[PDB]
């Protein structure tokens, strides 16, 4: 194993709070940190956690091509990896969602034989699902960059969710500190009219970046986007959500091959599971407490845990070590290098706990931490299967 | 404002480390916690952080409809909200991505006039982007539930990414503790053959759930999925990634309306930005260090910060308060109730810092924490615009 590593992490969107515990731990452990974030409280927070940080944002300039900036950002990181250092790069949101230089730097490091990894983070689309109260599963989700959407004529589906990033800089390859002149926004609006119609809703979304702020969740018709006062509000952190225009019917051949009908009625196209999408045009009110829902709630009084349910049955020493492996990158590296040596130095473990850690396999760790009933083993991670039908 | 609130949060996918700082803080502050997670180290961690927790997983049972379980899960949470308590629900990953009961409970609470919010988390798709080294922006992403994909005959795009959740339980509406009998998996494989061809790649993806584990990133042809030994490996935490089959050309009308050509050549369909997607079939090698890349790197020696760059210029007292607002839900609530009273009780703030906190607006906070050069204001969040073209 060569000296030198690159780990790229995210900060999430809302200042400080949306950073993951592991992103923080890698920032603290790093020899050198390079960052690109867009609020000052997050920047100040990062600087309290490591003594050797560099702001990547200084490599943008007026009329300097963004591609040249991204090549420079990547090279600054990889140069320190080649010197044998543990390097961490930090980007706002998820560091691989609509980001060029992270993928470039990781690919170069990997090709030259260094350790290289991206840790996921909370994206602007993750925030959109939470704030607009929608699930990508119901009824599917298409996600594009707005200029790419137009130039490559990417297809829409009127029966699924549509999410468009970078709607505030249609057709722009450069940078300006004061901001974008979004003079080709009308080209996007023309496309949305063609696909959806002039009276179809478009939601202008901006996630709150400070903890006390509310999100922007402003619904407009496609036609209203042509009004100059409304067009002016779309900027560099704006995303569009376009809800479905209609409900898609079921395929009879698939119903039969999956054996879903006992010769009769599947639910109708608009027999929706509560709650319905509030952004869809002409969406009917769905009943939250149907007779079937009331009967399920009545069964709560007599409920007992099923006999095949596996209750947690662990110890402080075992929960402490599993927490340490997740929150201490040095401890994890030590454990990975020698499972047996590490396991034998952990204080207060029971014999079973020690043995499970020595092996490292999931089933062993599960047996050590959960009580498995006889019922279960006289007959496999089974985590809300979602129902869309 | 009525007493009682519901906040639903996520844990991310990888044990403990992928929880956000704000998710942890709300779990600690809650009067009552309800959770549904699928590894025991995460469960044990949650129980160390609040004294009043209930496992929602005990409401599943063999041959009990999942919809009835979800109605029960929702009702247990909302009952405590109606009593005037601050309630937190916890689901693995992102709590609104392929999850029924979170959306139901939040909608009921909101309709009855209680405070209701979802905090985003790291999803299985977020992990997929990071581990497979792909960006949803290049060249767009379609995301579906596998049974819905089949039953509603949802469209594919051979030029964009495809992600399918719940490929281990095609056509199943119920639960079993030992697991799913995935006997209709061949119906999915038939559809993938029709859309992509028998020799097109499909990546079987399972994100690591413990910190020391590696992810499963196993590429197969569509044809290979019919082999019983391979089909057997697909389970309840399996997701499929299907890469594009071809590159989409540019539209001449849009090129002209966005003014991208000076009468000549736009880059060719396969003149890719480094790095290329390694999962695409017959993808050519892309040069990481072209002459333009070498010239950009040569400019690093003479680089200085641009005159319109805004360096961080804050204080310990200001960074401490902004951190507290993000990490202490009680402090945030106090600040939101009375900006001026809160601001005047914060120790050691400068006059400008105090004034910015009193107002609460983003531009005021930015001025207080960053030095704004004369160059800038003699002429707006501008955070990697991604280039896809
Ligand atoms: C270069 S990308 C970076 C995205 C980021 N890595 C992420 O994980 O969301 C910039 C685009 O992200 C979206 N974005 C960034 N901040 C946002 C916010 N606060 N609300 C909504 N969308 C945002 C916008 O579409 C913006 O044009
Ligand atoms: C009911 S959903 C819940 C998803 C979860 N809320 C999230 O944010 O990803 C279950 C599906 O998520 C995906 N999933 C869950 N854990 C996973 C893992 N470790 N790797 C890949 N996919 C996973 C699988 O497609 C699975 O069938
Ligand atoms: Cl969060
Ligand atoms: Cl029931
Ligand atoms: Cl993370
Ligand atoms: Cl340059």
Numbering used by the authors:
A (entry chain A), B (entry chain A): 7 to 385, 402 to 411
Can I see the authors' text?
While chemical methylation of an amide bond uses a strong base to generate the imidate, OphA, the precursor protein of the fungal peptide macrocycle omphalotin A, self-hypermethylates amides at pH 7 using S-adenosyl methionine (SAM) as cofactor. Omphalotin A derives from the C terminus of the OphA protein, and it is the OphA protein that methylates its own C terminus using S-adenosyl methionine (SAM). The structure of OphA reveals a complex catenane-like arrangement in which the peptide substrate is clamped with its amide nitrogen aligned for nucleophilic attack on the methyl group of SAM. Here, we report the structure of the peptide amide methyltransferase OphA including complexes with cofactor [SAM and S-adenosyl homocysteine (SAH)], cofactor analog, substrate, and product.
Mutants Y63F, Y66F, Y76F, R72A, R72K, Y98A, Y98F, Q172A, and W400A of OphAΔC6 were expressed in E. coli. Y63F, Y66F, Y76F, R72A, Y98A, and W400A were incubated with SAM and analyzed. The peptide carbonyl at i−3 hydrogen-bonds to the side chain of Tyr63, at i−2 to the side chain of Tyr98, and at i−1 to both Tyr66 and Tyr76. Y66F retains activity, and Tyr76, although within 4 Å of the carbonyl, has a Bürgi-Dunitz (44°) angle incompatible with attack, so both possibilities were discarded. Both Tyr66 and Tyr76 are, however, well positioned to stabilize the resulting tetrahedral carbon by hydrogen bonding. The resulting negatively charged oxygen of the imidate would be stabilized by hydrogen bonds to Tyr66 and Tyr76.
